[PDB]
UniProtKB/Swiss-Prot annotation, chain B:
<comment type="function">
    <text>Acts as a viral fusion peptide which is unmasked following S2 cleavage occurring upon virus endocytosis.</text>
</comment>
<protein>
    <recommendedName>
        <fullName>Spike protein S2'</fullName>
    </recommendedName>
</protein>
C-alpha cells in the first residue's frame, strides 16, 4: 500500500475538506439563526 | 517490461479518473457560486 501512498493521502484529504465544508456550513447556519437576535435579560421562559 | 508498464498505466489511469471525478464535483460548486454572485449583482448592486 505504500507504493499507492498518494491514493490514501488523497482520500484522507478529500474527506477532511468535505468535513471542513460541513463544519463551515453548520457555523453559517448557526450564524444565520443568531444574526440580529436581541433578548431581554428579564426573559425567563419558565414564567413567560 | 510490458508487465511493469501495464501496472504504471493502471495506476496513472486510476489517478486520472479520481482527478476527473474531483474536478467535476469542484466545478459544480463553482457554478453555484457564480449563480449566487450573479444574483447578488442583480439584487444587491444594480438594485436593492
Amino acid at each position: 500500500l505504500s507504493e499507492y501512498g498518494t491514493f490514501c493521502d488523497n482520500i484522507n484529504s478529500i474527506l477532511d475538506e468535505v468535513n471542513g465544508l460541513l463544519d463551515t456550513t453548520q457555523l453559517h447556519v448557526a450564524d444565520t439563526l443568531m444574526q440580529g437576535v436581541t433578548l431581554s435579560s428579564n426573559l425567563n421562559t419558565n414564567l413567560h | 517490461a510490458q508487465v511493469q508498464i501495464d501496472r504504471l498505466i493502471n495506476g496513472r489511469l486510476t489517478a486520472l479518473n479520481a482527478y476527473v471525478s474531483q474536478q467535476l464535483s469542484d466545478i459544480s460548486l463553482v457554478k453555484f457560486g457564480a449563480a449566487l454572485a450573479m444574483e447578488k449583482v442583480n439584487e444587491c448592486v444594480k438594485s436593492q
